[PDB]
Design a protein around this motif. Structure first.
Motif, PDB file in Angstrom:
ATOM      1  N   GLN A  72     -22.469  -1.363 -34.296  1.00 43.13           N
ATOM      2  CA  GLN A  72     -21.381  -0.396 -33.997  1.00 43.13           C
ATOM      3  C   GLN A  72     -21.070   0.384 -35.283  1.00 43.13           C
ATOM      4  OE1 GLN A  72     -19.782   1.040 -31.447  1.00 43.13           O
ATOM      5  NE2 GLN A  72     -17.664   1.513 -32.045  1.00 43.13           N
ATOM      6  N   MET A  73     -21.028  -0.289 -36.423  1.00 38.31           N
ATOM      7  CA  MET A  73     -20.736   0.336 -37.698  1.00 38.31           C
ATOM      8  C   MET A  73     -21.879   1.383 -37.940  1.00 38.31           C
ATOM      9  SD  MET A  73     -20.524  -1.041 -41.547  1.00 38.31           S
ATOM     10  CE  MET A  73     -20.041   0.072 -42.841  1.00 38.31           C
ATOM     11  N   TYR A  74     -23.119   0.989 -37.791  1.00 37.82           N
ATOM     12  CA  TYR A  74     -24.225   1.979 -37.941  1.00 37.82           C
ATOM     13  C   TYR A  74     -24.083   3.164 -36.952  1.00 37.82           C
ATOM     14  CZ  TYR A  74     -26.882  -1.686 -40.408  1.00 37.82           C
ATOM     15  OH  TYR A  74     -27.215  -2.643 -41.263  1.00 37.82           O
TER      16      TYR A  74
ATOM     17  N   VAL B 128     -21.225   4.472 -35.326  1.00 44.03           N
ATOM     18  CA  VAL B 128     -20.104   5.399 -35.496  1.00 44.03           C
ATOM     19  C   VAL B 128     -20.057   6.097 -36.833  1.00 44.03           C
ATOM     20  CG1 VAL B 128     -18.701   4.185 -33.840  1.00 44.03           C
ATOM     21  CG2 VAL B 128     -18.394   3.667 -36.253  1.00 44.03           C
ATOM     22  N   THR B 129     -20.822   5.634 -37.815  1.00 45.44           N
ATOM     23  CA  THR B 129     -20.968   6.293 -39.102  1.00 45.44           C
ATOM     24  C   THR B 129     -22.266   7.079 -39.221  1.00 45.44           C
ATOM     25  OG1 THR B 129     -22.004   4.424 -40.212  1.00 45.44           O
ATOM     26  CG2 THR B 129     -19.657   4.467 -40.197  1.00 45.44           C
TER      27      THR B 129
ATOM     28  N   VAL C  50     -22.253  -5.053 -36.578  1.00 44.62           N
ATOM     29  CA  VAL C  50     -22.967  -4.257 -37.509  1.00 44.62           C
ATOM     30  C   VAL C  50     -23.544  -2.991 -36.898  1.00 44.62           C
ATOM     31  CG1 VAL C  50     -24.762  -4.240 -39.287  1.00 44.62           C
ATOM     32  CG2 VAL C  50     -23.342  -6.207 -39.061  1.00 44.62           C
TER      33      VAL C  50
END
Ligand SMILES: Fc1ccc(Cn2cnc3ccccc32)cc1
Ligand SMILES: Fc1ccc(Cn2cnc3ccccc32)cc1
Lengths: 360, 360
Positions: free
Chosen positions: A167-169, A171-172, A165
């Motif tokens: 990593q998602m926060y 790279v976005t 989660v």
């Protein structure tokens, strides 16, 4: 027996175990076993072992105040070393896959694993998968009849999920949330409205702090059978706080630590990362400074990057850093004190974790 | 209530659960939740649900011969649907990551997930990680107090590991094993000495059969509390056998099923895969035919590919395929008979699995 030596001995032991099991139970040949041995060494070794040694250090603290047979001490220390290796291997998984994701070039003064000539992304993505799978193999084999096995597995799952989660926060973080859409190629934020302290705090809480601080302290507790010596809400709070501080430091060094000392060429500015520096800069900037930031951030052109580093230097971010540091010191020392209520021992392990972090 | 409808209802339920938990416990925002909802749908839905429905079908067979309260029936069916979704989600993880690894273009008549404009490899690698992590979240939430939880988790771990190992065997299958070396860029085999039936059998056993056949049959058993109705060595043998047959079929179709029907453009020949066709071709080739194979295999040039498909057609591989098929039918029917000794019910579920596979 000294803790670091023990920890390293256990690496050898676990390595041999995983590879012998590949031969006896998964039909591996000697050359693919060799490839996985070199992969394991290259991806898991060569750091300071901070994560995994924290498990050991926590366990060693409880051993000093708790009656056991010598064989039980050894069992506990071994478990702590295994558990610390589970966390090292989880980090190795994330470093392998995040290097690939992020188009990274170097790591620790060497090429990223996917960039080795005989690896390539085709193999490296899977090598990273295997790295994580080895964490579970370790647990199932060495902790099979342990009373903590359920709790350890369940915690480890949550930590790993929280991390993915994060990593998602991360790279976005340079995209406007309202425009996320699998169907549409993603533009960089032009307003930078989501470069805020609270958002940044979320990125960093998930991306790093669960696996780097939370999991090593609680795994120490679990192998020690000492969950009752702590108020787990305090442990979480202090973990998340120290870990934030660790990441802010990392952000600063990406921009200002010379590549040779850093071990890599930092590209946060080019990658438009929601970094501490960018958020803090924007926290204090006047209109002209914001406008110049927006005209230069997230561009590969080295002149644009230099304009961004000038803005940082000229905005005297050092001062904001000292103020942040001062507050964190304050709030960490406070949390430690609350932890002394149930366990001076555990509090002291947190104090060590804090010292190692605050100095490096 | 019809099994497929139940299975689909449970997808909706689980989807809602995972996303609600991201909001309450992992601080997700509505737009990133939306991105993960679309990712889950696009990566987990649109196939025939063979894997996950096998869990259900096995469980439904035991329900027909086993006394339970109605509420227990429902619990078992629900568990079977969850468990089947765990396997669908594991497959989705592997399809996402293997598409990226293999430079794949399409899957099921649509672009591979990493190729969607607003995804990219940077996100897709992590999306695939999350897919697997959701399998564990499912288990921990829905099976928390189940007597089978330990066994299910342990099995699932082994299956997943075996699978990652199989990917390593599959993507290195065109390299000479003695020259594997992270340090050295890997040349294609020139002698094709490792294109043998036994090697091919190893690739396929690990790459597909553990998650596609073994895990759905044994998960059916586990949710049913029916491990004692089977000799697990028979189950493994039949699983590995049927699954091999499934993969040989897949290999044939890659080369000979028109792209529109296949759902993608097959590139096994260009990728130099150790396929059934290549191994069988080499099993029967004369010197000239081998030499022509080696001059054309593993090359992107469409003329070279056409030379390879001519060699296949001219070598009348259909006949070897019928002979193989005939033996497999023989050996499957045998294994089913051995399974009837402890469970006509379980045997019949295997018979259905075999029919669905043998016909498609
Ligand atoms: F390692 C972790 C530690 C705490 C949390 C947050 N959290 C709190 N309660 C939970 C129940 C189920 C799932 C997550 C949960 C996440 C990861
Ligand atoms: F799903 C699987 C089912 C069986 C095996 C092979 N196997 C047999 N015994 C084992 C003990 C520990 C580890 C693996 C083992 C692998 C995966």
């Amino acid at each position: 027996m000294a803790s670091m030596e023990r920890f390293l001995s256990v690496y050898d032991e676990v390595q041999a175990f995983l590879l012998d099991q590949l031969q006896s139970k998964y039909e591996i040949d000697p050359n693919r076993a060799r490839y996985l041995r070199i992969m394991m060494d290259t991806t898991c070794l060569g750091g300071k072992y901070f994560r995994g040694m924290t498990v050991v250090n926590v366990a060693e603290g409880f051993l000093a105040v708790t009656q056991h047979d010598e064989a039980t001490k050894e069992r506990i220390l071994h478990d702590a070393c295994v558990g610390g290796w589970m966390i090292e291997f989880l980090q190795a998984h994330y470093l392998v896959e995040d290097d690939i994701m992020d188009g990274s070039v170097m790591r620790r003064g060497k090429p990223c694993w996917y960039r080795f000539p005989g690896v390539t992304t085709q193999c490296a993505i899977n090598d990273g998968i295997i790295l994580k799978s080895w964490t579970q193999i370790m647990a199932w084999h060495y902790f099979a009849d342990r009373p903590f096995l359920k709790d350890l597995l369940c915690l480890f799952q949550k930590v790993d999920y929280a991390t993915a989660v994060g990593q998602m926060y991360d790279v976005t973080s340079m995209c406007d949330s309202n425009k996320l859409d699998p169907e549409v190629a993603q533009p960089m934020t032009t307003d930078f409205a989501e470069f805020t302290p609270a958002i940044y705090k979320r990125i960093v809480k998930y991306k790093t702090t669960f696996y780097t601080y939370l999991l090593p302290l609680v795994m120490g507790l679990l192998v020690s059978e000492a969950a009752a010596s702590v108020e787990m809400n305090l442990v979480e709070r202090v973990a998340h706080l120290i870990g934030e501080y660790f990441q802010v430091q990392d952000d600063v060094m990406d921009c200002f630590t010379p590549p040779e000392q850093l071990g890599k060429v930092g590209t946060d500015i080019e990658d438009a990362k929601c970094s501490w520096l960018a958020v803090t800069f924007l926290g204090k900037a006047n209109a002209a400074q914001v406008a110049e930031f927006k005209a230069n951030y997230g561009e590969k052109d080295p002149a644009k990057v230099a304009v961004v580093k000038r803005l940082y230097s000229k905005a005297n971010l050092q001062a904001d850093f000292a103020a942040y540091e001062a507050e964190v010191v304050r709030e960490v020392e406070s949390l430690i004190e609350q932890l002394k209520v149930k366990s001076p021992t555990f509090a002291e392990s947190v104090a060590v974790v804090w010292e190692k972090t605050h100095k490096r």
